[PDB]
């Protein structure tokens, strides 16, 4: 059994809004807060968010089967990578994304220059008939922030590791070109995967090529 660890950081570009738990917000405060790590009250990118976004992008790039409804109806490569739950064909997810926590380097860079990690962005919604605007305060992570992301790939078939990591690179490229969060079509969620340190944490497998 081999486990390959991909440790790096996701650098925000336009500022991503992964919406939080929708807790009771103060009147006039952020109507839609970001998901934050409760222990440190720092914004994070959940591993579920990255995993779902990159899986959907990879499925679209490969091509959804006509009339696809369930996630288990994806292409066999996507099912092999991100896992399946179809009864009698449960494939283990080789990719185990982890929540991308606010990096200490970017945290210190924000402590300097007296910058808040999350910025409240004001938006409105012009009505189609009355032309009235409805104010909205959305919390968004600052553009200069960075989140240390941690992925683990499980080597289930040594022959398919190359193909799976090629699919991973394609999905990462798609996610860099696409957004990661809410409101990306309005410009919230652009990112890039700058640092990538692929090392075999467990096993005799060689990840230098990967």
């Amino acid at each position: 059994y081999s486990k390959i660890r991909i440790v790096g950081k996701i650098d925000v570009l336009t500022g991503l809004h992964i919406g939080g738990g929708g807790e009771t917000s103060m009147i006039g405060a952020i109507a839609s807060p970001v998901v934050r790590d409760p222990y440190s009250r720092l914004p994070i990118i959940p591993g579920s968010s990255i995993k779902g976004k990159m899986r959907s992008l990879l499925a679209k790039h490969i091509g959804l089967i006509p009339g696809q409804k369930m996630h288990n109806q994806d292409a066999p490569e996507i099912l092999r990578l991100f896992g399946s739950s179809q009864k009698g064909a449960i494939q283990s997810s080789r990719l185990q994304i982890s929540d991308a926590f606010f990096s200490k380097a970017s945290q210190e860079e924000f402590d300097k220059k007296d910058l808040a990690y999350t910025e409240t962005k004001f938006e409105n919604t012009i009505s189609r008939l009355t032309a009235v605007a409805n104010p909205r305060q959305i919390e968004r992570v600052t553009r200069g922030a960075s989140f240390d992301f941690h992925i683990i790939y499980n080597v289930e078939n040594i022959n398919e590791v190359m193909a799976d990591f090629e699919n991973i690179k394609t999905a990462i490229h798609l996610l860099e070109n696409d957004y990661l969060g809410g409101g990306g079509t309005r410009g919230n969620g652009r990112i890039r995967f700058v640092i990538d340190s692929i090392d075999t944490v467990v096993g005799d497998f060689d990840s230098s090529n990967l």
Binding site: M26, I27, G28, A29, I30, R41, A116, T118
Partner: protein, 129 residues
């Protein structure tokens, strides 16, 4: 809640916020003609420091937060001078006194409670209108 006491002696809390809003409710002009936008401007002045403290976890109020609270007192005085209705609102609700009280206490909890009191004031002003 458990912020301070008025000159008459009535305790200050969310219930006191509703009571003072009801008392100043006149039919519906509230606090002697206080428009909603002035109250929302005061609420945003509150909300700046509210966000600054809400992100932070320190029990004691940070020095920048205390400076912003004193500047908040200054803005309250300026709005009182510029608009009589805002002056009446602040006098009846004793907001400035609560700001100096939270400055004296220097606690995150007491500041959050004061922000909740101001939020209750705004909410009941919107409700009783």
């Amino acid at each position: 809640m458990e912020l301070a006491k008025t000159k008459t002696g009535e305790m200050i809390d969310l219930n006191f916020a509703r009571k003072v809003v009801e008392e100043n409710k006149r039919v519906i002009v509230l606090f002697n003609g206080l428009t909603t936008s002035k109250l929302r401007n005061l609420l945003e002045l509150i909300n700046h420091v509210y966000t600054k403290v809400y992100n932070s976890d320190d029990t004691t109020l940070s020095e920048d937060v205390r400076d912003e609270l004193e500047y908040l007192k200054v803005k309250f005085a300026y709005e009182s001078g510029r608009e009589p209705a805002v002056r009446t609102f602040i006098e009846k609700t004793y907001v400035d006194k609560l700001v100096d009280v939270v400055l004296k206490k220097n606690t995150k909890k007491i500041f959050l409670d004061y922000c909740k009191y101001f939020e209750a004031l705004v909410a009941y002003a919107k409700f009783y209108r």
